[PDB]
Design a protein around this motif. Structure first.
Motif, PDB file in Angstrom:
ATOM      1  N   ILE A   1       0.852  -1.182   0.000  1.00 29.64           N
ATOM      2  CA  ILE A   1       0.000   0.000   0.000  1.00 29.64           C
ATOM      3  C   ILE A   1       0.889   1.234   0.000  1.00 29.64           C
ATOM      4  CG2 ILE A   1      -1.888   1.215   1.146  1.00 29.64           C
ATOM      5  CD1 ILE A   1      -2.843  -1.308   2.313  1.00 29.64           C
ATOM      6  N   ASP A   2       0.580   2.182  -0.884  1.00 30.60           N
ATOM      7  CA  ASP A   2       1.294   3.452  -0.962  1.00 30.60           C
ATOM      8  C   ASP A   2       0.337   4.578  -0.593  1.00 30.60           C
ATOM      9  OD1 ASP A   2       3.574   5.257  -1.913  1.00 30.60           O
ATOM     10  OD2 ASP A   2       1.964   5.866  -3.276  1.00 30.60           O
ATOM     11  N   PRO A   3       0.332   5.049   0.654  1.00 33.06           N
ATOM     12  CA  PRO A   3      -0.629   6.088   1.038  1.00 33.06           C
ATOM     13  C   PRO A   3      -0.404   7.383   0.272  1.00 33.06           C
ATOM     14  CG  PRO A   3       1.016   5.798   2.751  1.00 33.06           C
ATOM     15  CD  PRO A   3       1.224   4.687   1.769  1.00 33.06           C
ATOM     16  N   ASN A   4      -1.508   8.066  -0.025  1.00 31.75           N
ATOM     17  CA  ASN A   4      -1.472   9.372  -0.666  1.00 31.75           C
ATOM     18  C   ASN A   4      -2.647  10.187  -0.142  1.00 31.75           C
ATOM     19  OD1 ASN A   4       0.685   8.848  -3.058  1.00 31.75           O
ATOM     20  ND2 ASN A   4      -0.668   7.070  -2.837  1.00 31.75           N
ATOM     21  N   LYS A   5      -2.825  11.383  -0.704  1.00 27.09           N
ATOM     22  CA  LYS A   5      -3.908  12.266  -0.281  1.00 27.09           C
ATOM     23  C   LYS A   5      -5.198  11.981  -1.046  1.00 27.09           C
ATOM     24  CE  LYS A   5      -2.384  14.975   3.031  1.00 27.09           C
ATOM     25  NZ  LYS A   5      -3.085  15.093   4.339  1.00 27.09           N
TER      26      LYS A   5
ATOM     27  N   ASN B   1       2.405   5.845 -13.599  1.00 33.83           N
ATOM     28  CA  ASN B   1       1.619   6.476 -12.550  1.00 33.83           C
ATOM     29  C   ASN B   1       2.411   6.473 -11.249  1.00 33.83           C
ATOM     30  OD1 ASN B   1      -0.226   7.208 -10.535  1.00 33.83           O
ATOM     31  ND2 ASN B   1      -1.954   6.294 -11.638  1.00 33.83           N
ATOM     32  N   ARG B   2       2.349   7.589 -10.522  1.00 33.98           N
ATOM     33  CA  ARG B   2       3.134   7.716  -9.298  1.00 33.98           C
ATOM     34  C   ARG B   2       2.779   6.619  -8.302  1.00 33.98           C
ATOM     35  NH1 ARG B   2       6.216  11.159  -6.338  1.00 33.98           N
ATOM     36  NH2 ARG B   2       6.284  12.626  -8.094  1.00 33.98           N
ATOM     37  N   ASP B   3       1.486   6.443  -8.026  1.00 30.60           N
ATOM     38  CA  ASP B   3       1.075   5.427  -7.063  1.00 30.60           C
ATOM     39  C   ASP B   3       1.414   4.028  -7.559  1.00 30.60           C
ATOM     40  OD1 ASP B   3       0.044   7.558  -5.590  1.00 30.60           O
ATOM     41  OD2 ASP B   3      -1.945   7.358  -6.498  1.00 30.60           O
ATOM     42  N   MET B   4       1.155   3.751  -8.839  1.00 33.21           N
ATOM     43  CA  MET B   4       1.492   2.442  -9.390  1.00 33.21           C
ATOM     44  C   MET B   4       2.996   2.207  -9.357  1.00 33.21           C
ATOM     45  SD  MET B   4       0.328  -0.370 -10.583  1.00 33.21           S
ATOM     46  CE  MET B   4       0.771  -1.777 -11.599  1.00 33.21           C
TER      47      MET B   4
HETATM   48 MG   LIG Z   1       2.139   7.935  -4.117  1.00 28.02          MG
END
Ligand SMILES: [Mg+2]
Ligand SMILES: [Mg+2]
Ligand SMILES: [Zn+2]
Length: 600
Positions: free
Chosen positions: A349-353, A571-574
């Motif tokens: 899991i990569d937390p983001n806003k 994608n940053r999260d991916m």
């Molecule tokens: Mg991220």
DNA sequence: CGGTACCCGGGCATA
DNA sequence: TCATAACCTATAGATATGCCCGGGTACCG
RNA sequence: UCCGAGCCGGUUGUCGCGCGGUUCAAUCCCUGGUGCGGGUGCUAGUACCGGCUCCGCACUAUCUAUAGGUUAUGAA
DNA sequence: AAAAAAAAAAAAAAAAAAAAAAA
DNA sequence: TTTTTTTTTTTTTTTTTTTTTTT
């Protein structure tokens, strides 16, 4: 530890359909709510009045005396010598406070239980506020007075000449914090701005244990720093800095949960004598008021209901107490590798806003939990729009917008706040008496609970019934950045623990700056695409936004000749999740963290 | 009109 | 810079028994 | 001051893409979930179930108040 | 001569570890 | 031995200067 737990339920289900008992419950909590509301203001009013001569030593008795004086007034006749002293000292101020606010003594009978809970709860608020924020405000005070933000802009960075100020700051901070004993050789060189700051902190008279740092002293006896914390707020007001609530206040007029125990139950709800109640079991005594057969009151994990609930007229919180009660780096995956190997499936899991959760596994199944999804499911924005519209119709927004600041430490300024609040108390009280305000709190809890329940259900159907979570260590707990919006970062760790889902932490160093396909950060590009601002108010202003969630790799091996872009978009999260899997895969194999992500 | 003695219940202390 | 909601995050505490005494009542002198 | 999610492409594991299309899900009332049983209900066939839905049994889900940061509205 | 859109570069806020010169 | 500051990490935003194009 796991000695207490709670199960929230609605007022209708919790209590039997008895009009008399329900009406008494609503009336009783309203009176207790008023006492708590005025008691907090009365406590601050007394502090602001006696601070001119000597700062009072606030104690549990001080809060208890204020509560009793508001209820009984001079009719309160304590027998303890310590309590009697506070009664005489506080009685003149409580009467003066009532005249300013116009509060009428409820003269409630059998309030001993309510006063004790409020006294303990309010005293806890004083300890926590000073304990967890005295150092924060004091350090903030130093920065504001010296204008560190201004110095950073004015003084170029990474210049040896300007390093003196930061080195100078350490010496100043040590003297101010009493870490280093002040000496004549250094005080003579203080500039006028520094000298003024030295006197102001000295006037605070910070307690300081000679054998331990200042931080340890705050934890050891946080209440000893309360006199300094209140006086510190005065400096903020004097210089115009952002004020902070030195003394907590129960400002909200909405029905606040009031704890109801067995003693309160028979005295106020059933309205029976003490002897009549002592001859009946506690569980039996409650069944005449609450439907204990419901789901909320059932025991869990060896914890049984013990006749203690808190209600606000719309929702009821049922507390389960374990019989063993008091009677009134290890979480990182590096230290838990064996557990991960035995896990059926591992999810990174990569937390983001905006994307609060972005999940991926070895199979490449991507799942995300966006803030917009939470807002729609929770209905916070829907409730916010309805709440704002309702205020405009009732005209309460214009009233609340002009209330004087309650954080002011001046007696005259605080008096104006009480008078203004009293001026429109009736109209605002009527507006907040509407069931909608309490229903939104209860409906929000149901919506929040369902939203999280769906998240776990969706994840389980996506990755499997049993899986291990390797979540990034990033979190803005208590320090949300300006703009943006509040997001759940550290709360997911508890949620997974509640659902018996193992949660492990992993460092995010270079996770969003390395291309997983080639495992190199040399050819990764960011902030290359630009488009009109997504925020409508910014968009109308003409400001432009730079794409942040889109990354690309220019390494030739990742490219294909057919592309006119010249970079493999990511994608940053991916991209972050893929790198985490590589880190986890290497650690599981025993090779440790990849050198590309090494902090070294 | 004066003084003794018993009981219930409210209120306060305490960890 | 201030006020009113909310979301999250952190802290602390998450009840019960014993005793005194005032008011009422009864009784004899 | 506005906002759901999944999928097919423009794309190549690409963007708060106010790019196109496509399937459901909630706008009100509601404490949530898991398992083990038992029972009106509607969508096909001439021995059989994916479903949404309420009854009893067990297990499971800690809140209140305050404070710090942020968001929305009303004021400077 | 003048004005608008897009690219490039930088700064702000909180904190994690890691490396360094100085108490 | 011990310690506070600077640098590179997440996330997202905000801010200013310049050139090219059009009028
Ligand atoms: Mg991220
Ligand atoms: Mg990350
Ligand atoms: Zn690459």
């Amino acid at each position: 530890p796991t000695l207490h737990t709670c199960n929230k339920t609605s007022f209708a289900k919790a209590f039997l359909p008895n009009e008399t008992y329900r009406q008494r419950l609503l009336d009783y909590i309203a009176i207790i709510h008023q006492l708590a509301d005025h008691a907090s203001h009365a406590l601050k009013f007394y502090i602001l009045s006696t601070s001119t001569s000597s700062f009072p030593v606030v104690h549990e008795d001080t809060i208890e005396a204020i509560l009793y004086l508001l209820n009984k007034g001079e009719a309160w006749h304590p027998r303890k010598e310590a309590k009697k002293a506070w009664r005489d000292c506080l009685l003149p101020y409580v009467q003066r406070y009532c005249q300013i606010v116009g509060f009428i003594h409820p003269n409630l009978r059998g309030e001993q239980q309510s006063i004790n809970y409020l006294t303990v709860s309010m005293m806890t608020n004083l300890k926590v506020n000073v304990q967890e924020h005295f150092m924060q405000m004091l350090l903030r005070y130093i920065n504001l007075r010296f204008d560190v933000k201004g110095q950073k802009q004015r003084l170029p960075p990474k210049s040896d000449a300007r390093k003196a100020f930061f080195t100078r700051l350490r010496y100043l901070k040590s003297v101010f914090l009493f870490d280093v004993v002040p000496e004549l050789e250094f005080l003579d060189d203080l500039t006028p701005l520094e000298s003024e700051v030295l006197e102001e902190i000295w006037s605070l008279d910070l307690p300081f244990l000679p054998n331990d740092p200042l931080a340890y002293a705050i934890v050891a006896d946080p209440m000893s720093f309360f006199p300094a914390y209140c006086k510190l707020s005065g400096l903020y007001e004097q210089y115009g800095f952002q004020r902070f609530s030195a003394i907590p206040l129960r400002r909200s007029l909405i029905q606040s949960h009031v704890r109801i125990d067995t003693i309160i139950l028979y005295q106020h709800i059933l309205c029976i004598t003490r002897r009549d109640a002592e001859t009946v079991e506690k569980d039996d005594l409650w069944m005449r008021v609450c439907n204990l057969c419901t789901k909320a009151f059932r025991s869990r994990c060896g914890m049984h209901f013990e006749g203690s609930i808190t209600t606000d007229g719309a929702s009821v919180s049922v507390y389960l107490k374990h019989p063993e009660a008091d009677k009134y780096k290890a979480l990182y995956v590096e230290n838990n590798l064996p557990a991960c190997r035995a896990a059926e499936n591992v999810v990174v899991i990569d937390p983001n806003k905006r994307d609060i959760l972005y999940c991926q596994d070895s199979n490449g199944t991507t799942f995300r939990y966006t803030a917009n999804q939470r807002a729609v499911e929770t209905g916070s924005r829907r409730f916010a729009k309805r709440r704002e519209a309702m205020k405009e119709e009732a005209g309460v927004d214009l009233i609340e917008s002009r209330i004087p600041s309650h954080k002011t430490m001046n007696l005259m300024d605080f008096t104006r706040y009480l008078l203004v609040r009293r001026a429109d108390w009736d109209r605002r009280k009527e507006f907040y008496s509407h069931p909608a305000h309490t229903r939104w709190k209860w409906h929000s809890f149901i919506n929040r609970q369902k939203s999280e329940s769906d998240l776990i259900s969706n994840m389980r159907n996506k990755y499997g019934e049993n899986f291990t979570v390797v979540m990034g260590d990033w979190s803005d707990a208590g320090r949300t950045a300006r703009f943006q919006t509040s997001s759940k970062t550290k709360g997911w760790r508890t949620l997974f623990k509640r659902n018996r889902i193992d949660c492990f932490l992993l460092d995010e160093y270079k996770t969003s700056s390395v291309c997983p396909r080639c495992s190199s950060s040399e050819f990764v590009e960011k902030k290359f695409k630009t488009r009109p601002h997504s925020r409508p108010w910014r968009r109308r202003e003409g400001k432009i936004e730079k794409v942040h969630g889109l990354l690309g790799c220019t390494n030739p091996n990742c490219l294909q000749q057919a592309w006119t872009s010249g970079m493999r978009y990511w994608n940053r999260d991916m991209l972050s999740t893929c790198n985490m899997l590589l880190i986890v895969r290497s650690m599981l194999d025993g090779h440790g963290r990849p050198e590309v992500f090494s902090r070294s």
